């Protein structure tokens, strides 16, 4: 019946059980089941996997074997016929700041990460793949359909490598393939501190006994810190401008430099740690480094949970928030905290919220310079624009003043991402994130669209007319049917995002259900949830419900004007107020006394 074990990629050491602090690997959160929610374990399955050979081969791998009677349409073709659009006019969200999109990518990276398989570097299969598009082993190419412009310009495919799985990393067979989640499942700010002890330690400043995080020594942002540079050459960040040779940043998560605005947010969090750390030393001079580090790390973890659950989720889920996430009632040690495989695709809805340009604003929110509005694709793994071109402040003003892209059925994913995505392994700005998502969907063996509608207790359309009704769109339904032949075959990623948004939210009914369950589970199944009695004191808690992203900005940048509600669309200068008007985090409740 049960396959209750395999376990090598699985970090391992004892629990303190009385320690008031989370471990780095997530281990020991649950006392009865210690590895529950830990990093480097398999992603949870809410539904049985669906592979072509029922074991590990993804659908579309063998070109003669169908899925429910039909061939699965090429990922790229679905991308071309349904996901793309040309006109960026009128695509912006009239009531969601650019920060709304950016916070999601943060939360996301704190929750899941399914890295690609290795099988060595000095490899020539990493070459056999992008070079000859030969499917086999972990190379699973995204072929181009006929009439694709990339055929004339890029080759016959886009290389793609399968995601890592448990038990090993190499040639495996037995049980059904299960992907790895290299990060901790709890909302614990592991994207700032790391998910491995090795990496957690390297990020720390273990010279001064101040419990500070290591900062860049080669550059400063007007007296403020930058994350240290990465050790690793060759570096993607310097590849995109060999004259500036500015390496990628080093952080608790390896995706930190994936795009300038994500690197900006990471910098804000690293700065807040140090601020909290030296601010604490000022109240408790006897406390040592470890103590300063852990007590800071704890506040920051609580901070991320509060903004997320109090300001972020209510405006994603909308009126469905209360339906899936009822008021907190206490830690439930029986709740499965782990991130499911499907969540890592459902949370990718944020990809349709990314706009095609990033702006830099000057002190009183005017265009910063002449090349102030930049195309998104010039910013992937671009760190030199931060170091050499103004610091983070100008980028932060743009997060508050500019808007997120609104999901639109006739305009899903901007071309900056759909045709010009830059991958760290490769050299070109010619990848397609939408095609990647779909090929990945299949790589993870995801059940079709209708299996998930059933799971969420929602109708399952079997016909065209039925699909029109659910999507409330005749044209979109048609295209989907033409490519998939049956709703049963629609990949969850596009199926889920193709649904119209629920009242006051930004995701449809299927997504709201998937997102909702997961968040309820990681709150309820987290022994260290900030509201769990005994984790913080009542006074420490009254002091924490006063935090805000605005304040975080005021305390860690030289910006002096900020909106009160950073997540909603704000117009300068009316909606903006002076920093000294916003509530500070009162740390006195963290002071101690001797005898
Ligand atoms: C400029 C903005 C962004 C870029 C360039 C970007 C890029 C990427 C790339 C390259 C992947 C890996 C795909 C794969 O190989 O399977 C990925 C994964 C993902 N992204 Fe994004 N992303 C962006 C924004 C966002 C946002 C705003 C959200 C949510 C609000 C989000 C959620 C996710 C999730 C859930 C994954 C899968 C992670 C895993 O392995 O567990 N992303 N992104
Ligand atoms: C732009 O987006 C905003 C959110 O979608 C929207 O306002 C939000 O509506 C909620 C409705 O519940 C309100 O939130 C709080 O309202 C009162 C305060 O007066 C509280 O006592 C309640 O507990 C509730 O949480 C706010 O009015 C607002 N939400 C937040 C967090 O501020 C705006 O109206 C939207 N603008 C337009 C033009 O649609
Ligand atoms: C690669 O990075 C280069 C620097 O990291 C960058 O060049 C820099 O940006 C512009 C050049 O276009 C110059 O900015 C302005 O500087 C002053 C004005 O304040 C004047 O000298 C000029 O008017 C100039 O426009 C920087 O001086 C320049 N720095 C260097 C060393 O060239 C490149 O644009 C980047 N190249 C690519 C392909 O990304
Ligand atoms: C570790 O922390 C120490 C203490 O702040 C840092 O040293 C200070 O850094 C700058 C010099 O670059 C100046 O403020 C002083 O010279 C130093 N002060 C003291 C008291 O030594 C050090 O830079 C940090 N190291 C890392 C890698 O982040
Ligand atoms: C703790 O959460 C678990 C789910 O992880 C809940 O378990 C339910 O237990 C009831 C009986 O009390 C059964 O009817 C169901 O089989 C369980 N439901 C689910 C969704 O698994 C339980 O309700 C919670 N326990 C407490 C005390 O709140
Ligand atoms: Ca985490
Ligand atoms: Cl799943
Ligand atoms: Cl096509
Ligand atoms: Cl700083
Ligand atoms: Cl450095
Ligand atoms: Cl990424
Ligand atoms: Cl909360
Ligand atoms: Cl370019
Ligand atoms: Cl029907
Ligand atoms: Cl709204
Ligand atoms: Cl300002
Ligand atoms: Cl807000």
UniProtKB/Swiss-Prot annotation:
Its cofactor is Ca(2+); heme b. It comes from the Eukaryota. One of its GO terms (cellular component) is extracellular space. The active site is at residue 109. Glycans are attached at residues 95, 205, 241, 332. The modification Phosphoserine is found at residue 198. Disulfide bonds join 6-167, 15-28, 129-139, 133-157, 237-248, 456-513, 554-579. Heme b binds at residues 108, 258, 351. It catalyses: 2 a phenolic donor + H2O2 = 2 a phenolic radical donor + 2 H2O; thiocyanate + H2O2 + H(+) = hypothiocyanous acid + H2O; iodide + H2O2 = hypoiodite + H2O. Ca(2+) binds at residues 110, 184, 186, 188, 190. Coiled coil: none annotated. Keywords: Antibiotic, Antimicrobial, Calcium, Cleavage on pair of basic residues, Cytoplasm, Disulfide bond, Glycoprotein, Heme, Hydrogen peroxide, Iron, Metal-binding, Nitration, Oxidoreductase, Peroxidase, Phosphoprotein, Secreted, Signal. Heme-containing oxidoreductase which catalyzes the conversion of thiocyanate (SCN(-)) into antimicrobial agent hypothiocyanous acid (OSCN(-)) in the presence of hydrogen peroxide (H2O2). Also involved in the conversion of iodide (I(-)) into hypoiodite (IO(-)) in the presence of H2O2. Responsible for the inactivation of a wide range of micro-organisms and hence, important component of defense mechanism. The lactoperoxidase-SCN(-)-H2O2 system shows antibacterial properties against some streptococci strains. The lactoperoxidase-I(-)-H2O2 system shows antibacterial properties against E.coli. Belongs to the peroxidase family. XPO subfamily. This is Lactoperoxidase. The chain holds residues 118 to 712 of 712 of the full protein.
